[PDB]
């Protein structure tokens, strides 16, 4: 019911479509009036993703856009999983599904964590690629394994592959 605008960007992973309202970013989708630099969520999201890919050493300098997908508008374990992942798991780190489950308030709910991650509407920004099965097992990805491994390699992680 929000008044939605969209923008596209090029990335090493193909074209990304951003959609959002004045209250926040809604979605980042892999497709395979505002000026850049502005405070509008879509513009902040654009800036953040471009820095992620092209100036990753500066990534913490960039404002994280407000998020307004309906999954962020109400309390839930799914929201806890997404927000805790965003808040806690930094560029270049990973966390296991099981430790994220505990972080999000339900230790041992690994399958529910996986379901929440599959429903992440803002991939890369909320870093579902940094959630792994265990120390030697990168686990699965809603976007596909090759993408998960590529992102981890971009961030210099041991579990990265490209
Ligand atoms: Zn909205």
Automatic annotation (TrEMBL):
<feature type="domain" description="Methylguanine DNA methyltransferase ribonuclease-like">
    <location>
        <begin position="4"/>
        <end position="65"/>
    </location>
</feature>
<keyword id="KW-0489">Methyltransferase</keyword>
<dbReference type="InterPro" id="IPR036217">
    <property type="entry name" value="MethylDNA_cys_MeTrfase_DNAb"/>
</dbReference>
<dbReference type="Pfam" id="PF01035">
    <property type="entry name" value="DNA_binding_1"/>
</dbReference>
<keyword id="KW-0234">DNA repair</keyword>
<keyword id="KW-0597">Phosphoprotein</keyword>
<dbReference type="InterPro" id="IPR036631">
    <property type="entry name" value="MGMT_N_sf"/>
</dbReference>
<dbReference type="GO" id="GO:0005634">
    <property type="term" value="C:nucleus"/>
</dbReference>
<keyword id="KW-0808">Transferase</keyword>
<dbReference type="GO" id="GO:0006281">
    <property type="term" value="P:DNA repair"/>
</dbReference>
<dbReference type="GO" id="GO:0003677">
    <property type="term" value="F:DNA binding"/>
</dbReference>
<dbReference type="InterPro" id="IPR001497">
    <property type="entry name" value="MethylDNA_cys_MeTrfase_AS"/>
</dbReference>
<keyword id="KW-0479">Metal-binding</keyword>
<keyword id="KW-0227">DNA damage</keyword>
<keyword id="KW-0539">Nucleus</keyword>
<feature type="domain" description="Methylated-DNA-[protein]-cysteine S-methyltransferase DNA binding">
    <location>
        <begin position="79"/>
        <end position="156"/>
    </location>
</feature>
<protein>
    <recommendedName>
        <fullName>Methylated-DNA--protein-cysteine methyltransferase</fullName>
        <ecNumber>2.1.1.63</ecNumber>
    </recommendedName>
</protein>
<comment type="similarity">
    <text>Belongs to the MGMT family.</text>
</comment>
<dbReference type="InterPro" id="IPR036388">
    <property type="entry name" value="WH-like_DNA-bd_sf"/>
</dbReference>
<feature type="binding site">
    <location>
        <position position="2"/>
    </location>
    <ligand>
        <name>Zn(2+)</name>
    </ligand>
</feature>
<keyword id="KW-0862">Zinc</keyword>
<feature type="binding site">
    <location>
        <position position="21"/>
    </location>
    <ligand>
        <name>Zn(2+)</name>
    </ligand>
</feature>
<comment type="function">
    <text>Involved in the cellular defense against the biological effects of O6-methylguanine (O6-MeG) and O4-methylthymine (O4-MeT) in DNA. Repairs the methylated nucleobase in DNA by stoichiometrically transferring the methyl group to a cysteine residue in the enzyme. This is a suicide reaction: the enzyme is irreversibly inactivated.</text>
</comment>
<feature type="binding site">
    <location>
        <position position="26"/>
    </location>
    <ligand>
        <name>Zn(2+)</name>
    </ligand>
</feature>
<dbReference type="GO" id="GO:0046872">
    <property type="term" value="F:metal ion binding"/>
</dbReference>
<dbReference type="GO" id="GO:0032259">
    <property type="term" value="P:methylation"/>
</dbReference>
<dbReference type="GO" id="GO:0003908">
    <property type="term" value="F:methylated-DNA-[protein]-cysteine S-methyltransferase activity"/>
</dbReference>
<keyword id="KW-0238">DNA-binding</keyword>
<dbReference type="InterPro" id="IPR008332">
    <property type="entry name" value="MethylG_MeTrfase_N"/>
</dbReference>
<feature type="binding site">
    <location>
        <position position="68"/>
    </location>
    <ligand>
        <name>Zn(2+)</name>
    </ligand>
</feature>
<dbReference type="InterPro" id="IPR014048">
    <property type="entry name" value="MethylDNA_cys_MeTrfase_DNA-bd"/>
</dbReference>
<dbReference type="Pfam" id="PF02870">
    <property type="entry name" value="Methyltransf_1N"/>
</dbReference>
């Amino acid at each position: 019911d929000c008044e939605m605008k969209r923008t596209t960007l090029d990335s090493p992973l193909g074209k990304l479509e951003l959609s959002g309202c004045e209250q926040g970013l809604h979605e980042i989708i892999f497709l395979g009036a505002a000026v850049l630099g502005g405070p509008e969520p879509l513009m902040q999201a654009t800036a953040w993703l471009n820095a992620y890919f092209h100036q990753p050493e500066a990534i913490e300098e960039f404002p994280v856009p407000a998020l307004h997908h309906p999954v962020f508008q109400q309390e839930s374990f799914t929201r806890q999983v997404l927000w805790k992942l965003l808040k806690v798991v930094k560029f270049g780190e990973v966390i296991s599904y099981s430790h994220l489950a505990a972080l999000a308030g339900n230790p041992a709910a690994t399958a529910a964590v996986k379901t929440a991650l599959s429903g992440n509407p803002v991939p890369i920004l909320i870093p579902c690629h940094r959630v792994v099965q265990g120390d030697l097992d990168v686990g699965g990805y809603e976007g596909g394994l090759a993408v998960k491994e590529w992102l981890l390699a971009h961030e210099g992680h041991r579990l990265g592959k490209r």
